[PDB]
């Protein structure tokens, strides 16, 4: 996360997420598969700390159609703070 948001690649994110899953107590979590990390806006002036966001995938269920994108955006704003 120290380097700029443009430098971070997908493989490094996957390595970080997998290592953090193994270290913490989520490795026993029922839906540990659904967890997925991403970077929203890879701007040059944004560091890793200012862009990393954790995303809980519920696309596999019909429930995802009920939850409009606006709610998810408000879930990512509060997470950022």
């Amino acid at each position: 996360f120290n380097e700029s948001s443009v430098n971070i690649s997908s493989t490094y994110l996957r390595k970080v997420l997998q290592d953090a899953i193994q270290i913490s107590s989520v490795k026993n979590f029922e839906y540990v598969d659904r967890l997925d990390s991403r970077v929203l806006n890879p701007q040059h002036g944004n560091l890793g700390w200012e862009s990393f966001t954790i995303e809980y995938k519920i696309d596999d269920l019909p429930m995802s159609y009920l939850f409009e994108g606006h709610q998810h955006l408000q879930y990512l704003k509060m997470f950022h703070f």
């Binding site: 270290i23 913490s24 107590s25 026993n28 979590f29 029922e30």
Partner: protein, 404 residues
């Protein structure tokens, strides 16, 4: 992170056995290392007509083998084998490889120095099984013989072998004989030098609480301190974060703990509001505290299902006024909303309070006075002088803490 527990001395082993049995009971791990299926969550409501999955972190303390068998991250160091035999018989899950078997403090210290390589190999073996180590936990008695010297030498060895890059707690038990004051001061010197956060337990105050054994209370307090770590919640969940909230400077590192005794009697506390007020009482603290005390930091533990937020908020507000805070520390009282283990059938609340007050002035004053009375090759006397000066170095510092 991971935590490694070290137990030194007969008293340390006696405490650690019950500490590990307590943890095993909370996490549903049987004495043979076999795990129990996790009961369904209580607040995870489900629709109704009218196996390895878990949501706790037991492996933070127990090493989970490939055969679904847990094993504590403990190291037992002493010389008398009877206590170790009793501990192993009570808990077969203890790894036999982790046991090391062999009055004057100097003799024990020299023995630890001579045989330091073997103990160091054992520490390194335990660390190698840990990824991203966090801290060490020490269970030893300040005075009593084997525990003092061996624990002091292990303290120095661990402090300097890893470059102090991991914090090191200490669940020291203070004594309630001509050699005891010497041992107490000599060990307290290394506690000042190396330990990062010391939980002072006084046997006399423990007996005062009990009559209303003594090792069970220590085990309960130690196993309840780390409740947020084993059942993660919104705050803390890291041993460094809990300690850092109570230690403003490296010198003011000595913590003391208060325990609510009535966890089982049918006249238990009515609600969280009552227990918040009762925890501040001075009759249930594990260290004798007078009325001139002042608190540098506050931390309250609550353990129960679906605690009422209104009661906790009102209790914090009422307790904030009662507590006499040090002038230069902002009035701050923090409550930890711990989660009760689903394996425990008891539904009553438990609550442990950990405090960093200025009552240490009187305790170390008593120790210093006894040492001065008893004093009345030459290298050892120089070490005695150094211990006297080091203890005074925090006596005067805790006194100055009163001043802006």
């Amino acid at each position: 992170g991971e935590t490694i527990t070290l137990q030194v001395g007969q008293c340390g082993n006696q405490v650690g056995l019950q500490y590990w049995q307590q943890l095993a009971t909370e996490h549903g791990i049987q004495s043979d290392g076999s795990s129990t299926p996790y009961p369904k969550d209580i607040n995870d409501l489900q629709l109704q007509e009218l196996g390895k999955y878990r949501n706790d972190h037991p492996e933070l303390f127990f090493t989970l083998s490939d055969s679904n068998t847990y094993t504590p991250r403990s190291i037992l160091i002493d010389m008398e084998p009877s206590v170790i035999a009793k501990s192993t018989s009570a808990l077969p899950m203890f790894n036999p490889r982790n046991v090391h078997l062999s009055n004057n403090w100097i003799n024990g210290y020299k023995y630890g120095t001579e045989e330091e390589e073997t103990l160091l190999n054992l520490i390194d073996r335990e660390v190698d099984k840990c990824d991203n180590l966090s801290n060490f936990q020490l269970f030893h008695s300040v005075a009593g013989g084997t525990g003092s010297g061996v624990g002091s030498k292990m303290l120095e060895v661990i402090s300097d072998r890893y470059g102090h890059k991991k914090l090191l707690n200490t669940f020291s038990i203070f004594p309630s004989v001509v050699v005891q004051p010497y041992n107490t001061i000599l060990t307290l010197k290394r506690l000042i030098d190396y330990s990062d956060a010391t939980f002072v337990f006084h046997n006399d105050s423990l007996n005062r609480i009990e009559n209303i054994g003594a090792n069970k209370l220590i085990a309960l307090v130690s196993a309840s301190v780390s409740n947020p770590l084993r059942f993660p919640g919104y705050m803390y969940s890291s041993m460094e974060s809990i300690v850092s909230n109570l230690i403003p400077t490296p010198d003011l590192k000595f913590l003391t703990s208060s325990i609510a005794p009535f966890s089982t009697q049918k006249h238990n506390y009515l609600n969280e509001y009552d227990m918040l007020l009762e925890l501040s009482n001075d009759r249930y603290k594990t260290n004798r505290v007078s009325g001139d005390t002042s608190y540098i930091s506050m931390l309250n533990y609550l353990i129960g299902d679906n605690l009422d937020q209104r009661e906790i908020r009102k209790g914090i507000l009422k307790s904030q006024q009662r507590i006499s805070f040090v002038p230069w520390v902002a009035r701050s009282v923090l409550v930890v909303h711990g989660k009760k283990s689903p394996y425990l059938k008891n539904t009553n609340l438990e609550g442990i309070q950990v405090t960093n007050n200025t009552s240490m002035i009187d305790v170390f004053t008593k120790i210093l006075k006894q040492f001065d009375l008893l004093i009345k090759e030459n290298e050892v006397m120089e070490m005695f002088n150094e211990s006297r000066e080091s203890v005074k170095s925090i006596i005067d510092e805790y006194k100055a803490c009163k001043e802006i």
